[PDB]
Amino acid sequence: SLGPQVAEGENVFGVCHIFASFNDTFVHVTDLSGKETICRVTGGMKVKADRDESSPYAAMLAAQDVAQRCKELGITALHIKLRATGGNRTKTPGPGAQSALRALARSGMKIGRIEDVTPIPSDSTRRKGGRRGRRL
Amino acid sequence: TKKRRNNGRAKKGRGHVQPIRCTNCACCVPKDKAIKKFVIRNIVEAAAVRDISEVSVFDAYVLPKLYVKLHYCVSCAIHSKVVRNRSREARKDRTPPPR
Amino acid sequence: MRAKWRKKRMRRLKRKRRKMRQRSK
Amino acid sequence: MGRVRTKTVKKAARVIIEKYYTRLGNDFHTNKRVCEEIAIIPSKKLRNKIAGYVTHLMKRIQRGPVRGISIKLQEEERERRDNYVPEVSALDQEIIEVDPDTKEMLKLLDFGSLSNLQVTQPTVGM
Amino acid sequence: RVQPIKLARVTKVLGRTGSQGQCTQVRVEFMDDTSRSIIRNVKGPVREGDVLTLLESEREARRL
Amino acid sequence: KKVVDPFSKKDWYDVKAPAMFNIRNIGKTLVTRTQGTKIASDGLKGRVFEVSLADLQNDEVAFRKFKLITEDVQGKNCLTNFHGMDLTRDKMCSMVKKWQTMIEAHVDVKTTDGYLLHLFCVGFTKKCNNQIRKTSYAQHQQVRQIRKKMMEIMTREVQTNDLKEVVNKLIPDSIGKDIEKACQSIYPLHDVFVRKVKMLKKPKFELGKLMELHG
RNA sequence: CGCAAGACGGACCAGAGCGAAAGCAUUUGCCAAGAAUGUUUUCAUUAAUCAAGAACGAAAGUCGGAGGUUCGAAGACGAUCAGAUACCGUCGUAGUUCCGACCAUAAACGAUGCCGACUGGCGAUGCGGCGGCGUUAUUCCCAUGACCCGCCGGGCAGCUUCCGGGAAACCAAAGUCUUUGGGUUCCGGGGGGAGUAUGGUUGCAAAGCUGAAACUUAAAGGAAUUGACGGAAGGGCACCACC
RNA sequence: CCCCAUGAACGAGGAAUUCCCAGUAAGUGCGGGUCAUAAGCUUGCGUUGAUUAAGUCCCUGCCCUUUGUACACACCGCCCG
């Protein structure tokens, strides 16, 4: 956990890679390159209940931990990439999407960027549930 | 009887219309029967916006938006309540709801 | 569905009558 | 609280203020004793209500008219504005200004007097 | 959470909520900065100008 | 992986941009130390660095993201090379809306080196003059002219000129502005951007030419 | 970060277009075809509707090959439920894809034959042509494109109402109908029994077409109105309701 | 009704459920009614005297509008194999 060689005049930027997709939340802090990475925490790790894995408060507790490990290395600022769901699915933020952002900022982390990244199709393969969909 | 003069929605001069899949029902309906609601929102939902904008490495930066086009079907529209029953003398409107 | 099922049960029955007469021949 | 005044109060209140307009104060107690004397009231409690609303009407009527109730002096000033408002006679400075093809109409009325012009611009909307 | 106990005061009351009207939404100013404000859900019968004792401010609420 | 603190086994580095920007100091990365088989510098090549345009030039728009590959490592300095340009989602999305006709074309083109590129452009119809029309659309014939002229420009300017000069034209986005005026007569258009570029080949490292870019 | 395979053309895409109907949305080229409009060109009644007969005709299915991601009848499990061969979750064969042959059916619905004439208003939209005071784009132009204003054809629709019709719902056609007759094809006769029985005909198969009677019954059905009911929606209320 | 003797269950109540918002709940006594003899009942009266709410439509139920219906013996309805 040894710092970089300059961080006293400028900030160093990691990338957040928030996943939000339903029944879970990931936060996964990486390098700028993203070819290597550091600690990775889920909301399913804080609270096991098989339904609080996507909980708002579980996502807050997650980012509240992650933001420590940032400062432990030297990372102080974050570009952020969001990910809804995609893959021919809902593509709508989870409950713990708004949550984690608000939490990591107020813990004491600077914001560099924040964007949408979703792997949306340009018209592709059939979706589970058949012609009449679900109905329960 | 007939409850409509358009039956489904807008099929005029054409035979088959390409289908589309509901977002949440996951059902299958025509392109022109589905309620097509486009959506605009802020990333942070403009709720933590003051708390976010103040803490940054940039002086100013107005946040992106989240663009999603949702297609609901007959059942999944009524149940989530983006529509409701209307009077028999007032079904006939082409007018969006007041903004 | 009810009417379509009444037409279907009578389809399977009709097929059996055919089979039973074809068997005897 | 609750309680909105009934129709028996609001109906008769209007009559009593109209015909004894100049006999009302803006005090409860005076207007109470007056209603007892100028008319029968079949109860005392009923009187104490009808008086209080008669009072409440008389406050607003001195700031201009309340619909459905017409006192004399307001209908006076109504007529006084309607026989002539104070504002000048003039129609509207005694000069007419016309545009192209308004003048063409006037040729076909077989007249032509007091020419002026203002030149108009293409075209409707944009 | 385990951070020092907070104190925040009412600026305005909004209306009652819950499934029997048992909860009361209220808007509160953080009483250490008035540019910071959160909406909360409070059990008791609150009024105006009262001070509360929040055990966190990580939570942010807007209904139950 | 499973060892005690493998973040004390990493070696920091820096990542330098070519001299075509006001700010050339991109940032810092790390790879694992040189093992008895694996070696730091070879595992520090081949990366991608999505980076904003505003961040490096510091004079211009946020949208447009550039990919940069580390093609060589040299003594704690990671030299970069162009890899292809992208775009943001939101800008590209906001322009698309009902009552317009979207116009697109692409071309495959070669530089005057071993580089090969595959540019993708876009146009949108204008809400023409001060219309009282409730929509603006272009016929199918009209579109095919505009597409033909969107190919012509984007081959001419990239078939000529070497790799570095290509980059110089894409940074202010001179290319798109040129197309907007050249198609103007047959339908006026507002907006031209080159939404993607995809590099497909490259010759060799060419160490002398590499260092040309970084002075 | 790179690679492979098959599938597929989102957002732009709408009471918009084209097609005889079924149907038809990435680029470019090639091949033949067609409508509308313009026309002081040509032919001189060459037409309309149609037994026999003919072409095309979704999805599923059958036969023989190729291919096989994705989804998925069948099938095997996990739950829910008194039970649960179901709804829900996981896995998964036939099939889904393509090539070569068959199969002729659908709420193949506008539940509204085709051709022709006459009878209100208004604003739009797609295509062609015509006119014009205006702006804008390029060489200042002309040629031309974009917008603006108006007109004439034919096309998809809408709005409007004491034309008239209709049992009513509604409809510028479902109108011009006891004041009953423009041309012509197909087809109906209380509800069931029954698209069954039977013979014919077609098909490899699956089935399609044609298609009864004995016997039974006084109702079946359409539109509209008033109530009641709703594990429908919106308002409001009660310590015989709750907190 | 009185006197002396005799001296049981019961150690605060399972599943459920009732009533109540100010001199109100609860504690506590007295008069009337029935009455030859007799209130653990009912009907009135004082005295002592809190907690908790100032709401909501969640449950139970009721009023109004809109909508759907093969129901009108009115969903405790009707109807299928």
Side-chain angles (χ1 to χ4, degrees), chain F residues 71-72 79-80 205-214:
Chain F
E71 193 164 294
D72 286 294
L79 301 160
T80 50
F205 293 162
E206 300 299 302
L207 305 174
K209 297 187 180 181
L210 209 305
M211 284 298 304
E212 182 189 293
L213 308 172
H214 294 264

Side-chain angles (χ1 to χ4, degrees), chain C:
Chain C
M1 297 305 189
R2 206 274 87 76
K4 187 165 65 176
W5 298 163
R6 185 169 178 180
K7 197 184 68 170
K8 183 181 180 298
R9 74 191 302 167
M10 181 175 69
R11 190 160 292 178
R12 265 61 172 159
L13 189 59
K14 186 169 177 174
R15 191 159 62 193
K16 190 190 74 177
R17 296 174 179 173
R18 185 188 181 189
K19 195 173 189 299
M20 176 273 293
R21 290 174 63 234
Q22 287 176 304
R23 190 252 81 191
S24 298
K25 295 180 66 58

Side-chain angles (χ1 to χ4, degrees), chain A residues 5-110:
Chain A
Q5 309 300 289
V6 177
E8 297 74 56
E10 57 185 66
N11 294 279
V12 282
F13 293 93
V15 185
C16 199
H17 301 281
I18 303 178
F19 202 6
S21 55
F22 292 133
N23 311 324
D24 218 66
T25 304
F26 281 72
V27 181
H28 183 200
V29 180
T30 57
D31 306 311
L32 188 62
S33 53
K35 186 66 72 65
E36 308 195 300
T37 185
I38 57 172
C39 196
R40 186 181 65 210
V41 179
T42 53
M45 184 180 300
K46 310 294 86 171
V47 176
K48 289 72 169 62
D50 292 73
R51 68 170 190 168
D52 288 291
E53 303 182 302
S54 51
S55 185
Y57 153 71
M60 294 183 188
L61 294 177
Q64 202 61 244
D65 183 64
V66 169
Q68 295 190 0
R69 308 295 81 184
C70 296
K71 297 182 289 183
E72 196 174 68
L73 179 61
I75 305 299
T76 40
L78 289 169
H79 301 302
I80 304 180
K81 288 183 170 63
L82 189 55
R83 182 177 174 199
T85 302
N88 208 303
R89 293 298 301 177
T90 191
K91 67 175 186 298
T92 301
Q98 193 181 11
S99 298
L101 296 165
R102 179 173 171 78
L104 58 89
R106 296 189 289 110
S107 64
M109 300 301 295
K110 304 187 181 182

Side-chain angles (χ1 to χ4, degrees), chain F:
Chain F
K1 295 188 181 296
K2 196 172 181 295
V3 297
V4 182
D5 199 355
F7 312 111
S8 295
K9 306 297 178 297
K10 303 294 188 64
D11 294 349
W12 293 84
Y13 279 84
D14 284 68
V15 189
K16 306 301 299 187
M20 286 188 285
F21 296 99
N22 290 359
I23 305 173
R24 297 176 65 251
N25 195 72
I26 312 181
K28 294 182 179 61
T29 47
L30 46 73
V31 273
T32 307
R33 63 177 63 263
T34 298
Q35 303 177 3
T37 298
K38 300 186 177 182
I39 179 168
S41 297
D42 293 301
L44 181 51
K45 290 173 179 56
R47 293 178 162 199
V48 174
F49 288 115
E50 297 169 60
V51 285
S52 301
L53 179 51
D55 193 61
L56 298 177
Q57 185 57 243
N58 193 244
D59 201 58
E60 59 183 352
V61 295
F63 52 93
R64 292 185 288 272
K65 294 170 67 64
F66 283 65
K67 297 186 187 300
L68 290 173
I69 47 173
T70 297
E71 193 164 294
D72 286 294
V73 178
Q74 293 186 356
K76 302 285 161 294
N77 303 110
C78 300
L79 301 160
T80 50
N81 187 58
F82 187 61
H83 196 226
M85 196 179 71
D86 306 300
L87 195 57
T88 55
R89 301 292 180 139
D90 64 295
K91 191 64 179 65
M92 191 58 193
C93 192
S94 57
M95 294 187 288
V96 177
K97 58 179 180 62
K98 299 196 304 302
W99 319 129
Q100 300 180 311
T101 301
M102 186 180 195
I103 300 178
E104 279 198 351
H106 60 93
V107 291
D108 294 292
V109 67
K110 178 171 64 60
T111 54
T112 53
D113 301 296
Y115 295 94
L116 289 179
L117 296 170
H118 188 176
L119 288 78
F120 293 88
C121 194
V122 61
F124 290 94
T125 55
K126 196 173 181 178
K127 184 66 168 62
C128 311
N129 299 281
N130 301 291
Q131 273 179 0
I132 197 58
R133 271 277 292 277
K134 296 83 171 64
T135 190
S136 185
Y137 291 143
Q139 303 185 297
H140 182 68
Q141 204 66 262
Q142 302 284 264
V143 166
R144 285 171 44 73
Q145 299 183 119
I146 297 170
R147 289 195 288 216
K148 198 62 60 176
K149 293 176 176 61
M150 186 181 287
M151 289 176 180
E152 186 189 299
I153 296 175
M154 190 157 64
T155 46
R156 189 173 63 215
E157 270 57 78
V158 185
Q159 187 173 65
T160 61
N161 309 117
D162 49 70
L163 193 278
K164 179 172 62 179
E165 294 180 282
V166 182
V167 179
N168 297 347
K169 291 188 292 293
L170 291 169
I171 288 170
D173 200 67
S174 301
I175 304 296
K177 185 54 60 181
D178 190 59
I179 298 169
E180 196 172 298
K181 180 177 174 61
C183 297
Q184 191 173 19
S185 299
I186 54 176
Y187 220 77
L189 310 178
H190 73 299
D191 283 303
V192 183
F193 291 100
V194 275
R195 50 189 295 272
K196 292 171 180 170
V197 183
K198 296 190 70 176
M199 188 172 287
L200 179 59
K201 291 291 175 294
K202 51 178 71 280
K204 286 182 170 62
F205 293 162
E206 300 299 302
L207 305 174
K209 297 187 180 181
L210 209 305
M211 284 298 304
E212 182 189 293
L213 308 172
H214 294 264

